[PDB]
Amino acid sequence: MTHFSQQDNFSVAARVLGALFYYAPESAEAAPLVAVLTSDGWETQWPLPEASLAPLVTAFQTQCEETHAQAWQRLFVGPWALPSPPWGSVWLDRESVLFGDSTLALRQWMREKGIQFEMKQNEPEDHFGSLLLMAAWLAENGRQTECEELLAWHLFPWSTRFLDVFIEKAEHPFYRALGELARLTLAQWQSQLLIPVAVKPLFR
Ligand SMILES: [Cl-]
Ligand SMILES: [Cl-]
Ligand SMILES: [Cl-]
């Protein structure tokens, strides 16, 4: 009878994933979490079976010529095209623009729920990382229904496709393993929804 968002380390997992997608690995926000995932022990706390996490433990700790900072810059910043853009409207808007039609639906939904959760200046609300941070924060506030709506309606319709391509093209053991951790985790949560996941055609 307890909602999935209020148990099994939901908000901790959502925050760790959200922060590592949204913040550079050498930042104050993400560095402590890179430390955690590159250390032994995390797999015993993560809300997924240890046997499933075993290959990810090794991968997070694989040394690599390219630094975490360089990989994150390349995957999430630039200067070149991102291998798997982390904003929903790229996948959901027929034209794949930022601040697209799905981004407005998200904004309208947040306004409707009285949600104020502001992130980077000039950036859209539908970044994968900030959606997980917002959902984590909603869960911490006990707002299980809105947490579930956010996931069902504004993240899950496109997040599987984004992670598929992200994992395929990550090209760094740490971010590949991160994508895989996120894919397993989000799929677990999706299986626990009490409302139907939204279903949308994808354009990338
Ligand atoms: Cl490290
Ligand atoms: Cl629009
Ligand atoms: Cl509620």
Domain ranges of the chain: 1-204
Read off the tokens for 65. Answer: 């010529």
Contacts of 83 (CB under 8 A, 6+ apart): 75, 165, 166, 169, 170, 171
Residue showing tokens 């299980």: 144
Please give the CATH topology (third level) of the domain spanning 1-204. TorD-like (1.10.3480)
Using CA atoms, how far apart are residues 6 and 142, in angstroms rounded to an integer? 7
Instruction: Please give the angle made by the CA atoms of 165, 117 and 37, to the nearest 5 degrees.
Output: 50
Resolution for this PDB entry, in angstroms: 2.0
Among the bound ligands, the one closest to the CA of 141: 3
Residues 138 and 150: beta-carbon distance below 8 Å: yes
Residues paired with residue 127 on neighbouring β-strands, in sequence order: 87
Q: Mark the residues whose beta carbon lies below 5 A from ion ligand 1.
A: 38
**How far away, in angstroms, is 96 Cα from ligand 2 center?**
11
Contacts of 45 (CB under 8 A, 6+ apart): 9
State the method: X-ray
